[PDB]
Amino acid sequence: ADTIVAVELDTYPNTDIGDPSYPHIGIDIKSVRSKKTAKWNMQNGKVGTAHIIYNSVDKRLSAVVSYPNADSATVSYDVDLDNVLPEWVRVGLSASTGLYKETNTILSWSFTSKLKSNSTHETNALHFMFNQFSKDQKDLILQGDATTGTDGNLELTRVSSNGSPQGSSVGRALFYAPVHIWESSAVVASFEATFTFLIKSPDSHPADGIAFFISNIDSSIPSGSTGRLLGLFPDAN
Amino acid sequence: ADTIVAVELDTYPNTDIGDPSYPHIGIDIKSVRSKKTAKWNMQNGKVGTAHIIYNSVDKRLSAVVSYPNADSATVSYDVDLDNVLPEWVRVGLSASTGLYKETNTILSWSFTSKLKSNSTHETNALHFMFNQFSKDQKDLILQGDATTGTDGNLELTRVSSNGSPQGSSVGRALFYAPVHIWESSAVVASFEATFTFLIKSPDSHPADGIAFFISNIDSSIPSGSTGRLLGLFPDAN
Amino acid sequence: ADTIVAVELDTYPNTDIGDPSYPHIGIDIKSVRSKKTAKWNMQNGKVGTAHIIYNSVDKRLSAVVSYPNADSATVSYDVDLDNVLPEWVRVGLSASTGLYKETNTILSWSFTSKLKSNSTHETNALHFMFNQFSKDQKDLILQGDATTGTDGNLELTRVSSNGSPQGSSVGRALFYAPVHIWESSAVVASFEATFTFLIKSPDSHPADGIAFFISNIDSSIPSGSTGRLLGLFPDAN
Amino acid sequence: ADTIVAVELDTYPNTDIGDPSYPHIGIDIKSVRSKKTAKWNMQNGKVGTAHIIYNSVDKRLSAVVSYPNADSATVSYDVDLDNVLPEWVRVGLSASTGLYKETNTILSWSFTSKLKSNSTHETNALHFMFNQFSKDQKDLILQGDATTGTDGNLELTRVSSNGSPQGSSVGRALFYAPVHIWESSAVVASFEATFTFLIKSPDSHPADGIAFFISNIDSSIPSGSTGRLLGLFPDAN
Ligand SMILES: [Ca+2]
Ligand SMILES: [Ca+2]
Ligand SMILES: [Ca+2]
Ligand SMILES: [Ca+2]
Ligand SMILES: [Mn+2]
Ligand SMILES: [Mn+2]
Ligand SMILES: [Mn+2]
Ligand SMILES: [Mn+2]
């Protein structure tokens, strides 16, 4: 099976797989059963921003999510990612709907990876920033239902022409280039990701959420990972 | 045939294909016959730096090369790259040797691409920086004789274990991710590339040079493009 | 007198000092009488973005301005700024009103300056980005009527509490740190500025505009530089 | 008295003020008596690099120092800098010698400060990078014995023309612009500093070290802060 590290914006509480009984931000290490969550005051129809930060000195994966005119939600977990992830990875966004549904719209996505060595010429770096997506976005691998180009946005899950979200949808977008998160001469390794999203549902109960994920390079959508499994996990172990 | 835009650091004057009678920096638009050159005081065994800049407002491709304790060489050409290159490209380094030979060693390589749209959320961006290369550099496509990992460097052409360069060698390295250099809503499109190189030869006449290139995404080494053709062109038309 | 280089977004045509008979983008070298203009389809009450670019290799000062859902205006002028500006400068925004008036609101401002030397350790750099301004913005020098903190914005000219602009107003904001735009070992010197602005007037004829400017470090608002002189020039020579 | 947060590269063990009995990297919160140290294998005459990182989510100040062909030293301390430092600060390098002496040479210095707000337009940023210093570096405040321009370097402490360091010297360099490290709408605040240094002494026992520091904006060299007090503290409380 794939190896997954993710920050989930989980819109629907599934309490039998350990979700708290509210929308929440979570750190997922190789399981949909978050190692840590915080309450998330998700706003149906409002544009949000999530920030994800990590470094190999502090070995702490941290996330913050907010809306304009609102407080943030934040969550941290002590994990050494060198011990979880291979040396080379791909980074991605995943989203799903089930019998409950929402738009999983991404208006922007940026990622920065930095390896500082002990050489006087320290810094290796990867940085991308998407504020506009095109119908043919060749530096993304789209998986399952994901599409680009609708109002210059990334639609991770299925949306009708009417703008209405579809249930039982799963899609992901991975950056084309493998990312080097560990190197033998690196003294400091860090990454930062940001995405702005619009989760809208005609229903009082949207589902199921958006995740920023890091994976083995060859990661694909696990069979039957609609709904609560977020296109990340083959099961809820 | 492939579509090529390159800045050549041409170490060997081939006067029958229009080289001036000295080492020179050149702008190559779809031909090894530079649209413009400047005299280059190449130094056998010294670490050099080349900078390449362009923007869609000025439509001018410019390069500067220098060594520590030395003057620069610079060359400019008015070209609109939207009229030459497809919307999506790959960016690369190429090098060759012929019957005359040199090391084509790259110690570092960086590239920045920026598309600013008329949206209030203006900037799309790609940035990579290599100061260390590893034996398995998965974000590079190596072609022909190119290898990574020897003293943390990129060797574009064949080098023996003794450090001695081999003749009749051609190799390239392309960044894995396609790069988006034109987009319909872009008001300003710009790129910057930098590489530091070490061209060393036991001979008074090194050959044949290093180029930074932009190409169709599916670009490969043209048959018989050792020596004066720099791994860029199938012939000298 | 001060030494001024500016890109003007000139909202009011003053044809006796060479303004074309429409709102226009201009390059000002040591005179309010632009060395080049382009027609600007200014939109009363809409949020705009201007981009300014320059490099010491091409010696071309270029600007682009746009609104969402609208075409850009662009203007270029060949000038070597090493021949106009001292080695050390300050960079700023200026705005004015006269008997005709407008808000000169700045929602964001960024600037990047880069000096690449012939040393293997090439890059000197300055970068700032403001997306929020506070009541006490200590890294800005505010001059004349300029204030910060109203709805997290920079108000270059006087606005009443009702949001109504005042006439006969002049204000500027300069970044606190002097900027080094020429250095003896520099092989490439470049800068990029971006600002997003909101020019709103209850009148069919707003005045007088916003400028991004570079100056001697000790620059101050010239006496009587309200209206058509944009807080930049003591007169219209 | 001034308010100081510093990472010290302490070259001389003063065991009566809590130094361990070896050269060491330390975190100094308002006292020369480090809140945490790690053993530092300082190399007389070799060019080193220190990296300093912090963020307001993890509230952990971390540093790494290394040489080429050598292991790193690292040190971390949990501190919330919003509780120690004012909203506005200056950032600096300090160095001293006493009766034991060393060169306190800086070949390069960079700093990045980022405030991400809950606004859709998230990022405020300051970034500077010095790889070359000039005799008149107007974006630095030099204090005590500090000078710029000798071989394009920053000399924090007194050096004769022969290159020989002087004892009983103290000097600092602060970036000219105040830096905004806390803002009321900020959801994430982070900084990164890097400097490369050359500590050389004709003696087997060099003294006293280099520090990266953050201070009240009006910070000056405390009276009698040569030697073990590093130009940071008026005493060893
Ligand atoms: Ca759930
Ligand atoms: Ca040739
Ligand atoms: Ca006018
Ligand atoms: Ca000490
Ligand atoms: Mn969950
Ligand atoms: Mn040639
Ligand atoms: Mn005008
Ligand atoms: Mn100490």
Q: Residue A49 and residue D196: Cβ atoms within 8 Å?
A: no
CA distances (Å), origin A145, targets A97, A176, A233, D76: 11, 17, 16, 44
Q: Which of B75, B116, B184, B198 to mutate to test the interface with C (most CBs of C within 10 A)?
A: B116
CA C214: distance to chain centroid? 8
Beta-carbon contacts of C161 under 8 Å, excluding residues fewer than 6 positions away, are none
Query: Taking a C-beta distance cutoff of 8 angstroms, is the pair B232, B211 a contact?
Result: yes
Look at residues B103, D8, B20 and name the one whose alpha carbon lies nearest to residue B10: B20
Q: How many domains does chain A have?
A: 1
Q: Which of A66, A72, A195 to mutate to test the interface with D (most CBs of D within 10 A)?
A: A66
A-side interface with B, Cβ within 8 Å? 88, 107-108, 110, 115, 117, 119, 121-132, 134, 136, 138-139, 152, 175-180, 183-185, 217
For B225, what's the count of Cα atoms within 13 Å in the CB-facing half-sphere? Answer: 26
Number of residues written out for chain A: 237
d(Cα B126, Cα B146) in Å, to the nearest integer?
Answer: 24
Look at residues C49, C131, C68, C102 and name the one whose alpha carbon lies nearest to residue C227: C102
Q: Residue D138 and residue C217: Cβ atoms within 8 Å?
A: yes
CA distance D227 to chain C (A): 31
Beta-carbon contacts of D73 under 8 Å, excluding residues fewer than 6 positions away, are D24, D25, D38, D39, D40, D41, D64, D65, D66
Structure tokens at A58: 């502090």
Q: Which residues of D touch C107 (CB under 8 A)?
A: 121
Query: Taking a C-beta distance cutoff of 8 angstroms, is the pair A127, B126 a contact?
Result: yes
Distance B35 CA to ligand 1 centre (A): 60
d(Cα A73, Cα A37) in Å, to the nearest integer?
Answer: 10
* Phi-psi map region of C45: left, alpha, beta (phi>0 left; psi -120 to 50 alpha): left
d(Cα B193, Cα B65) in Å, to the nearest integer?
Answer: 12
Look at residues C150, C128, C151, C157 and name the one whose alpha carbon lies nearest to residue C140: C128
d(Cα B233, Cα C86) in Å, to the nearest integer?
Answer: 46
Query: Taking a C-beta distance cutoff of 8 angstroms, is the pair C156, C104 a contact?
Result: yes
Burial readout C56-86 (b: 16 or more C-beta within 10 A, e: otherwise): bbbebbbbbbbbeeeebbbbbbebebeeebe
Q: Which residues of B touch C54 (CB under 8 A)?
A: none
CA D49: distance to chain centroid? 12
DSSP state of C79: -
Look at residues B190, B201, B6 and name the one whose alpha carbon lies nearest to residue B92: B6
Amino acid at C33: R
Query: Taking a C-beta distance cutoff of 8 angstroms, is the pair D209, D8 a contact?
Result: yes
Q: Which residues of D participate in the annotated binding site? A: 8, 10, 12, 14, 19, 24, 99-100, 208, 228
Q: Which residues of B touch A152 (CB under 8 A)?
A: 119, 185
Structure tokens at C220: 């101050």
CA angle, C135 then C139 then C145, to 5°:
50
d(Cα B104, Cα B171) in Å, to the nearest integer?
Answer: 9
Taking residue A21's Cβ as centre, other Cβ atoms within 10 Å add up to 9
E strand or H helix at A97: none
Torsion, Cα of A50, A56, A59, A65 (10° steps): -10
Ligand 1 ion: nearby residues, β-carbon < 5 Å: A 10, 12, 14, 19, 228
d(Cα B46, Cα B23) in Å, to the nearest integer?
Answer: 15
Q: Which of B47, B118, B188 sits opposite C67 (nearest CB)?
A: B118
Amino acid at A136: D
Structure tokens at C109: 């401002």
For B179, what's the count of Cα atoms within 13 Å in the CB-facing half-sphere? Answer: 28
* Interface B-C: count of C-beta contacts within 8 A: 78
Annotation-wise, does B10 bind a ligand? yes
B-side interface with A, Cβ within 8 Å? 88, 107-108, 110, 115, 117, 119, 121-132, 134, 136, 138-139, 152, 175-180, 183-185, 217
CA angle, D64 then A91 then A16, to 5°:
105
d(Cα A94, Cα D184) in Å, to the nearest integer?
Answer: 32
Query: Taking a C-beta distance cutoff of 8 angstroms, is the pair B208, B103 a contact?
Result: no
Burial status of residue B71 (CB atoms within 10 A of its CB: 0-12, 13-18, 19 or more): exposed
Query: Taking a C-beta distance cutoff of 8 angstroms, is the pair A160, A167 a contact?
Result: no
Q: Which residues of D touch C184 (CB under 8 A)?
A: 134
Beta bridge partners of A189: A115
Q: Residue D53 and residue A55: Cβ atoms within 8 Å?
A: yes
Distance D14 CA to ligand 4 centre (A): 5
Instruction: Please tell me the number of the ligand nearest to residue A6's CA.
Output: 5
d(Cα B109, Cα D220) in Å, to the nearest integer?
Answer: 41
Q: What are the backbone dihedrals phi and psi of residue D229, each rounded to the nearest 5 degrees, phi first? A: -95, -5
Range of the domain at D228: 1-237
Q: Residue D57 and residue A66: Cβ atoms within 8 Å?
A: no
From which experimental method does this structure derive?
X-ray
CA C173: distance to chain centroid? 9
Annotation-wise, does A2 bind a ligand? no
DSSP state of C222: P
Taking residue D137's Cβ as centre, other Cβ atoms within 10 Å add up to 21
CA distance A68 to chain D (A): 5
d(Cα D116, Cα C196) in Å, to the nearest integer?
Answer: 18
DSSP state of A205: S
Query: Taking a C-beta distance cutoff of 8 angstroms, is the pair B5, B59 a contact?
Result: no
Taking residue A15's Cβ as centre, other Cβ atoms within 10 Å add up to 8
CA distance A195 to chain D (A): 10
E strand or H helix at A180: strand A179-180
d(Cα D27, Cα A74) in Å, to the nearest integer?
Answer: 26
Resolution (A): 2.0
Upstream peptide bond of A28 is cis (omega within 30 degrees of 0): no
Look at residues D220, D125, D114, D235 and name the one whose alpha carbon lies nearest to residue D174: D220
For C26, what's the count of Cα atoms within 13 Å in the CB-facing half-sphere? Answer: 27
Distance B19 CA to ligand 6 centre (A): 5
